[PDB]
């Protein structure tokens, strides 16, 4: 059991930080007017455009 | 000049929201629900760093938006107060022109298109250097002089 | 100028077909009879990714095809029902100027060369945002302003 809820635990850190990592890269593009995301970059990072 | 949409936020006003490009946006540092109960109810992405939330704006307002350019010419420019002298990549304006409660105050260019939006100032003996949210092509920034509280 | 065809429906015209270099353009979503019958007649082609209906000119009894540019300089440009203002990467109409079933009409340059074709609009506001079908110097292209309804 301790086992089992240390690796969710690091798994879910995991998850979480990365989420952060998404939207410390993503929001300085959603600041920006025009918001030119390169597809690369969408696909990467999981994201939807603003400008359809 | 020709535009004023600088919404305020609060009975207590202290600082403006605008509209520009696609985006409402607003400095992070100032307190308080946007008013006009429209963009109230808007999801704001907020930015410590660069001190700004920012949102989309409804289409039915968009054509209330100030026109957005990146590129700055060395010269001056015009805002509500009067006008910044932009030399060294850096604005200033007369000493006293700029108080707390005039953040978020859009700067135009002489089309009356917006280049930055007004966070506070730094005293230097007649004139005062802008702490300032700008941009470069395709990416927000913040000019921070020495000493500068904020507005 | 008179580059049009009407496109009729049973009933009533639901669009506008039109002559742009070889190739006669029409929007994939008027359902519609073309009013001349070697057009209607011509076998036609369908994509639904850009909305946009096409055919091959028989250039030997049309060569009265409008030219067309790629180029997108900001500024007006005209839609026979008034001044287009191209600003950023949107077109802006006055709001009374369209009405649904007059999608297919080209916009034209000051030079009347064939820019873009609008596929719709959406109520803007104080204007309305023009959802146009434009081309690059290789491909085609959507432009789709949020809130944009069919026409």
Same mark, same amino acid.
């Given at each position: 059991?301790?086992?089992?809820?240390?690796?969710?635990?690091?798994?879910?850190?995991?998850?979480?930080?990365?989420? +952060?990592?998404?939207?410390? +890269?993503?929001?300085?593009?959603?600041?920006?007017?025009?918001?030119?995301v390169?597809?690369?970059?969408?696909?990467?990072? +999981?994201?939807?455009?603003?400008?359809? | 000049?020709?535009?004023?949409?600088?919404?305020?936020?609060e009975?207590?006003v202290?600082?403006?929201?605008?509209?520009?490009?696609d985006?409402?946006?607003?400095?992070? &540092?100032?307190?308080?629900?946007? *008013?006009?109960? *429209?963009?109230?109810?808007?999801?704001?992405?907020?930015?410590?760093?660069? *001190?700004?939330?920012?949102?989309?704006?409804?289409? &039915?307002?968009?054509?209330?938006?100030?026109?957005?350019? &990146?590129?700055?010419?060395?010269?001056?420019?015009?805002?509500?107060?009067?006008?910044?002298?932009?030399? #060294? #990549? /850096?604005?200033?304006?007369?000493?006293?022109?700029?108080?707390? #409660? *005039?953040?978020g /105050?859009?700067?135009?260019?002489?089309?009356? /298109?917006?280049?930055?939006?007004?966070?506070?100032?730094?005293?230097? #003996?007649?004139?005062?250097?802008?702490?300032?949210?700008?941009?470069?092509?395709?990416?927000?920034?913040?000019?921070?002089?020495?000493?500068?509280?904020?507005?």
């Amino acid at each position: 059991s301790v086992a089992s809820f240390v690796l969710l635990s690091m798994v879910g850190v995991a998850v979480g930080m990365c989420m +952060c990592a998404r939207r410390r +890269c993503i929001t300085p593009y959603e600041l920006t007017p025009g918001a030119t995301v390169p597809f690369l970059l969408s696909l990467i990072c +999981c994201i939807r455009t603003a400008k359809a | 000049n020709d535009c004023i949409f600088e919404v305020k936020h609060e009975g207590k006003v202290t600082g403006y929201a605008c509209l520009v490009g696609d985006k409402v946006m607003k400095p992070a &540092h100032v307190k308080g629900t946007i *008013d006009n109960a *429209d963009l109230a109810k808007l999801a704001f992405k907020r930015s410590s760093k660069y *001190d700004l939330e920012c949102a989309q704006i409804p289409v &039915h307002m968009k054509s209330d938006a100030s026109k957005f350019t &990146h590129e700055k010419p060395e010269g001056y420019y015009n805002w509500h107060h009067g006008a910044v002298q932009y030399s #060294g #990549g /850096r604005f200033t304006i007369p000493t006293g022109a700029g108080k707390p #409660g *005039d953040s978020g /105050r859009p700067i135009f260019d002489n089309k009356g /298109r917006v280049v930055a939006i007004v966070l506070g100032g730094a005293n230097e #003996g007649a004139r005062t250097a802008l702490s300032v949210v700008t941009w470069n092509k395709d990416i927000v920034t913040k000019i921070t002089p020495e000493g500068a509280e904020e507005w």
